[PDB]
């Protein structure tokens, strides 16, 4: 019955009506152990969440959970895994292998993708969940 | 011919004459792609470097490469993966899922283990190497 921290991710893409997100399941919380590292990119064998797009690198970025000091809940860190295209966390540009700790609500922009991320705090630190929502509108 | 960043790790343990480091190869640089994450612990299937010790958690900690902003070389981040035992980076205690960016030279203490870490900068950012040395003396 222990609440689980969930990272709500509202995503958008102008060509999303082409099935770019066909590999992604929406409104479905997927439990991940705190040992796991969530990866995004076009490669199905390397990434848990994949996009059918040539402009997407094999691995675009990774999200990993961690505990901030003097905090009893899970937070998340992002790291750009793309040599080619940058990764915008709000107003900040993340080059190849740059990393940042994520706030509770932020916007991810890589290429033409737009991700709105919102962290809902739970009690558990052994696991976390992910949920996706598709936006018909652009996010900015 | 491109130089590769190497993390030199001098390790010590009072019971190291029992074969705790029998699974570890010394004076051998092992190349790792910058996508990899190096893990330490007793579990052979989850960790690349393993110790035959009940007091060692399944996964003790992880080392992952990243690029500091305004820097053209690889750096490393550590994250304690042990619920049970803390992880000392120099004078700092890292609890469960706490993380820190490593300096060029630091000391790792978990349980009765002692790791001296020294980063030798290379040119490559697509890969990094690891090398181990066993110390007959304690490190502090």
Residue numbers in the entry:
A (entry chain A), B (entry chain A): 10 to 149
What does the original paper state about this entry?
Full-length mouse TIFA with a C-terminal His tag was crystallised not only to reveal the structure of mouse TIFA, but also to elucidate its molecular assembly in a crystal. Mouse TIFA is composed of twelve β-strands (β-1 to β-12) and adapts a β-sandwich structure. Electron densities of nine N-terminal residues (Met1 to Thr9) including the phosphorylation site, and 43 C-terminal residues including the TRAF6-binding motif (from Gln150 to Leu184 and His tag) are missing, which indicates flexibility of the N- and C-terminal regions in the crystal. The overall structure is very similar to that of human TIFA, except for the region between β-1 and β-2 (from Ser27 to Ser37 in mouse TIFA) with root mean square deviation (r.m.s.d.) of 0.7 Å for the corresponding 128 Cα atoms. In the region between β-1 and β-2, structural diversity between mouse and human TIFA is observed due to either a deletion or an insertion in the amino acid sequence. The overall structure of the dimer is very similar to that of human TIFA, with r.m.s.d. of 0.9 Å for the corresponding 256 Cα atoms. The dimer of mouse TIFA, related by a crystallographic two-fold symmetry, is formed by van der Waals contacts and hydrogen bonding interactions at β-5, β-6, and β-9. In the centre of the dimer interface, a hydrogen bonding network is formed between Lys108, Glu86, and Asp110. In addition, there are hydrogen bonds between Gln73 residues, between Ser43 and Tyr105, between Lys88 and Pro74 (main chain), and between Asn107 and Lys76 (main chain). In total, fourteen hydrogen bonds appear to contribute to the dimer formation.
